[PDB]
């Protein structure tokens, strides 16, 4: 470039490429005669061939060309496993390992963190010698959450950066494209290969007034996720732009593009501004600030673009939301949730309080939360309910502890836990409640999906803001308005709080505290990375087999699933974690969450040949080793939720073949293509009332696949009868030759020694 900015601090060699960003705008731009949208400039000016690219919105798959990779330890094993099986000597673009996602809440900060290393050393050590070895930057257990560490370091204006967990798109808060992505997506960009995204819709949140009072930047996702619904953002990326966007800072707009992931949009984000500019200078970046304020024309929307969808929130009109119990999408008022909650049977008071994960863990977050605290302690009070604080990084803890704020939290009762997801995955020994117990918890988190968080189906879990989750932890319960109310506080009065009054970013500058990086050796020619043979907490993959070249005839149905199938259906998380880079120790809880439509039950499907109920792991399995090779049936928006990879190889692992549904979410059915089984969808989804359990399929005309053809598919009934419905898919050639080859893994091996 003729500027030598780096990427970042860990990387001071790599510079940011805006002069090529600019290029690709340039020439897109020409080629279409049209204004171009934030998101548009960012993705089409790192498109791999911008001249050539042909480019429909919804439409085409752009081969893009990422920044960076960054990765969580609950993804990051299987990733660098499959990396591993490619053969390649190092990583060709700048990656980060993240150990956060091992890491049980139990007693709090340092006595979980010590046990956790202790219970994972196999894991941690095989992350870190993989890391050194292939020139993978490695953020040590500890110290803080993969969004967080990214966003206090690694993001920046018009980067395009992918991450194998679904809220890398909080990463849109300091004006970046971010996108998760199941481990094979990562491994083509460390491969150095094309990575390829179905081009994106663009849908325009325009934010008008300023945000006053109780109200925070969460409200405005909690407004619009209720707006859209969990299907509302399938397909596009998410937009905010207007005079609004100016009234929120820098981590809370990564707030509202982190929870965009719960609307199942491709990623969120924000045009660059001041407050970008401020966030970048006190976080150590000033010069990338410098850098991008030259190219501030490109990291802003061109006048008068054009959005598919245009949404309008008034700021100003803005009031405190809580959205549950059950999907992020059921929004409430915090005026109204007590009403709701009697009418509708859910439990008042307020058993467990928790703030922070990387949602809501800014400096800003913990002060206001702390502002709140405060005022309940000048009046001797403390929280009614348990009360726990995850900070997001080692730096946010190091700095709110310094600044005084950490003790606030733990004088009205809260334990501060360690730097890591935490209950937010559900890793969480939990004890107030016996399971079963019918109980409410509101957190500052993002999903609060059954399960999601402690693995009780009966906890009523509700997301609001850090500040409403700290008033109502005193409050004991649903039933209180921050805003309206009046506590009795231990000197007999009443009073009422006060909106959180408190600093964006520190007077002072930021303490990133000590040991938290592993830096890669672009010496040690000789590491060595030794997956023990009968390790059960990782296993070395072996290659799936290339397609026979015949159709699929007489599948068998292993199960036909009744409404939603989330990943956690599909690949439970929880005890599951310790095995994710254990291929078949993890698909033993292949889809034991899913609902069988023939019996309304979770794990008992009929075998077909024996003609018992039971779990359908080893169903599989037996049909497996039977020779029977199997298919799923699904509803709608099949897949949604987490990204886990496992999601698609434990199927393919144990004998599936197809998975054909109404709809897929966008990372597991990208996950499907990779591991060579095949997405399909109903061409009329009445026709999933046509197949039952009972009846075989023939999908017929793989010989002849092709992009844009359907696929034929013939239901064989116990009595004869045959049907043929049509099928679609969304496969362009690339993909075709990974199903072809086995999985994409194996068709990136015929491209060397084949
Ligand atoms: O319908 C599809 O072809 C896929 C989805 C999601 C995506 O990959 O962007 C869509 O285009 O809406
Ligand atoms: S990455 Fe963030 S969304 Fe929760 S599971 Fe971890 S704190």
């Keep these: 470039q003729r500027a030598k900015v780096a990427m970042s601090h860990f990387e001071p060699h790599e510079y940011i490429r805006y002069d090529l960003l600019e290029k690709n705008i340039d020439i897109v731009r020409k080629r279409l005669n049209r ?23 919804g439409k085409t798959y752009l081969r893009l060309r990422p920044d960076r990779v960054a990765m969580q330890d609950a993804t990051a094993q299987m990733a660098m496993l499959q990396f591993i099986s490619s053969g390649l000597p ?26 956790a290393k202790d219970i994972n050393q196999e894991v941690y050590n095989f992350l870190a010698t993989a890391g050194a070895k292939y020139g993978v930057g490695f953020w040590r257990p500890g110290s803080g959450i993969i969004h967080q560490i990214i966003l206090e370091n690694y993001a920046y204006p018009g980067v395009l950066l992918i991450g194998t967990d679904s809220h890398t798109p909080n990463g849109g808060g300091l004006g970046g494209i971010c996108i998760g992505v199941g481990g094979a997506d990562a491994v083509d960009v460390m491969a150095g290969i094309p990575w390829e995204l179905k081009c994106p819709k663009v849908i325009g949140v325009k934010l008008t007034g300023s945000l006053s009072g109780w109200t925070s930047p969460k409200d405005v996702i909690l407004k619009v996720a209720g707006i859209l619904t969990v299907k509302g953002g399938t397909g596009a990326i998410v937009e905010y732009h207007g005079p609004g966007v100016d009234s929120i800072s820098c981590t809370g707009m990564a707030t509202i593009c982190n929870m965009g992931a719960e609307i199942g949009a491709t990623t969120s984000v924000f045009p660059y501004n001041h407050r970008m500019k401020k966030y970048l200078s006190k976080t150590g970046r000033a010069d990338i600030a410098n850098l991008a304020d030259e190219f501030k024309d490109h990291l802003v929307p061109d006048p008068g673009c054009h959005y598919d969808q245009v949404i309008e929130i008034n700021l100003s009109e803005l009031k405190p939301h809580i959205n549950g119990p ?82 606030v939290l733990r004088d009205v009762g809260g334990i501060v836990l360690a730097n890591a997801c935490g209950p937010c995955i559900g890793q969480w020994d939990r004890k107030d409640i016996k399971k079963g117990e019918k109980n409410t918890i509101v957190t500052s988190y993002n999903r609060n999906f059954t399960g ?16 409403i989750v700290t008033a109502l932890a005193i409050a004991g319960t649903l039933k209180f308005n921050p805003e309206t109310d009046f506590l009795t506080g231990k000197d007999g009065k009443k009073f009422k ?49 290339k397609w026979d070249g015949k159709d ?89 939720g987490s990204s886990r990879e496992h999601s698609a190889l434990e199927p393919r692992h144990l004998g599936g073949r197809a998975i054909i549904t109404k709809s897929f979410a966008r990372i597991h059915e990208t996950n499907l293509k990779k591991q060579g089984l095949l997405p399909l969808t109903f061409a009329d989804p ?69």
């Design 326 to 407: 059950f999907t992020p999408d059921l929004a409430h008022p915090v005026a109204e949730v007590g009403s709701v909650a009697e009418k509708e049977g859910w439990p008042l008071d307020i058993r467990v309080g928790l703030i922070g994960s990387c949602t809501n863990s800014s400096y800003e977050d913990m002060g206001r939360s702390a502002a709140v605290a405060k005022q309940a302690l000048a009046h001797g009070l403390k929280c009614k309910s348990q009360f726990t604080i995850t900070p997001g990084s080692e730096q946010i803890r190091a700095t709110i502890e310094r600044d005084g704020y950490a003790q």
């Design 686 to 754: 009445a026709d999933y009332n046509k197949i039952h359990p009972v009846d075989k399929l023939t999908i017929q005309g793989l010989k002849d696949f092709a992009p844009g053809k359907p696929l034929k598919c013939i239901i064989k009934h116990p009595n004869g009868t045959q049907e043929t419905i049509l099928l679609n898919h969304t496969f362009n050639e690339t993909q075709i030759e990974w199903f072809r080859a086995g999985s994409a893994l194996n068709r990136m091996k015929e491209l060397q020694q084949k």
């Design 35 to 57: 204004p171009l949208t934030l998101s548009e400039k960012i993705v089409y000016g790192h498109l791999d061939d911008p001249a050539n690219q042909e480019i429909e919105r």
């Design 552 to 640: 699929l005839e007489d599948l068998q149905i292993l199960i036909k699933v009744k409404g939603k199938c989330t990943t956690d259906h599909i690949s439970a998380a929880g005890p599951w974690l310790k095995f994710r880079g254990h291929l078949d120790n993890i698909s033993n809880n292949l889809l034991i969450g899913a609902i069988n439509i023939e019996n309304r039950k979770a794990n008992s499907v009929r075998n077909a040949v024996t003609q018992e109920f039971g779990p359908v792991p080893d169903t599989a399995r037996y049909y497996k080793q039977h020779g029977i090779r199997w298919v799923v049936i699904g509803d709608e928006n099949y897949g949604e």
């Design 452 to 467: 999601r968080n402690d693995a009780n189906p009966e906890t009523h879990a509700f997301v609001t803001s850090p500040e």
């Design 90 to 115: 190092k990583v060709a673009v700048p990656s980060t390992i993240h150990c956060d996602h091992l890491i049980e809440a139990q007693l709090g900060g340092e006595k979980d963190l010590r046990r």
């Design 497 to 545: 709080l006060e909106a959180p009054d408190a600093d964006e970013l520190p007077r002072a500058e930021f303490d990133p505290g000590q040991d938290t990086y592993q830096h890669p050796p672009k010496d040690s020619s000789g590491q060595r990375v030794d997956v023990s043979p009968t390790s059960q907490r990782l296993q070395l993959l072996e290659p799936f087999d």
